[PDB]
Amino acid sequence: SHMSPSERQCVETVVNMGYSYECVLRAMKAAGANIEQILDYLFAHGQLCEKGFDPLLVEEALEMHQCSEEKMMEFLQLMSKFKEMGFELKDIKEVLLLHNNDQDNALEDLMARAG
Amino acid sequence: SHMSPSERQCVETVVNMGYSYECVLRAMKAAGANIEQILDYLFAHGQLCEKGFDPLLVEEALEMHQCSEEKMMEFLQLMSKFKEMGFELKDIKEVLLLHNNDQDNALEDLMARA
Ligand SMILES: [K+]
Ligand SMILES: [K+]
Ligand SMILES: [K+]
Ligand SMILES: [K+]
Ligand code: NA
């Protein structure tokens, strides 16, 4: 197998917890071959989708903010807002990262390039 | 320029704090285009190299453990120790990650596969 021994151990254990292979493999690609990190990703991804967030934006938020749930949520909410205004995702990520999720600074930057 | 406006802003600001372009671009690639993130990476990388850690291993530790400075140090120390014992970096990273930096479990794993 192309997988390492630790990768296979993660898949075996998390699939035993009741997750599909596809979900586990995707989560492990994102979160790394550690069981708690995979489960935390799977649970957070599920909870956020259930709240109505776009799964693509959820995935961006989980990648961008691995350390703070509070910052992750702030990033997710503002990314959702700016995306619904019509800005491009690549620009939104960039300005939220530069400005530490400050809504006013991020918007000022996005507008300066809106067209 | 191939860089985004935010990337250019970071380079301009950080080079102004007296860092070389090459150091800033490398740090930005690792840490992302946010000035505090770049400065924190540059400073940590410097401090750990000054303590005598292999810069290649320092870079692996800064990548693996962005959230906990204590976890980052514990990983860096163990990766250095296991490398001295003669194990391969790729294996070492894998077992330290799986076993949450537990030395004995990681070691038993490494010896078992060797
Ligand atoms: K890997
Ligand atoms: K963070
Ligand atoms: K890593
Ligand atoms: K961490
Ligand atoms: Na990100």
Author numbering:
A (entry chain B): 386 to 500
B (entry chain A): 386 to 499
Reported in the publication:
Two constructs covering the UBAP1 C terminus, residues 381–502 and 389–502, produced ample protein but did not crystallize. One of these mutants, with 415-KKGE-418 mutated to AAGA, readily crystallized. The 1.65 Å resolution crystal structure of the UBA-containing C-terminal region from UBAP1 has two molecules in the asymmetric unit that are linked to each other through a disulfide bond. However, multiangle laser light scattering indicates that the molecule is a monomer in solution (data not shown). It appears that the disulfide-linked dimer is formed as the protein oxidizes during the crystallization process. The structure shows a single domain consisting of seven α helices arranged as a right-handed solenoid that contains three overlapping UBAs (UBA1, UBA2, and UBA3). The relationship of the SOUBA fold to conventional UBAs can best be described by regarding the third helix of one UBAs being also the first helix of the next UBA. The solenoid arrangement of the three UBAs forms a convex surface containing helices one and three from each UBA. The opposite face forms a concave surface built from the second helix from each UBA. The residues showing the greatest perturbation lie along the convex face of the SOUBA domain and cover an extended hydrophobic surface.
Here we show that ubiquitin associated protein 1 (UBAP1), a subunit of human ESCRT-I, coassembles in a stable 1:1:1:1 complex with Vps23/TSG101, VPS28, and VPS37. The X-ray crystal structure of the C-terminal region of UBAP1 reveals a domain that we describe as a solenoid of overlapping UBAs (SOUBA). NMR analysis shows that each of the three rigidly arranged overlapping UBAs making up the SOUBA interact with ubiquitin. UBAP1's function is exclusively required for degradation of ubiquitinated endosomal cargo but not for other ESCRT-I-mediated processes such as midbody abscission or viral budding.
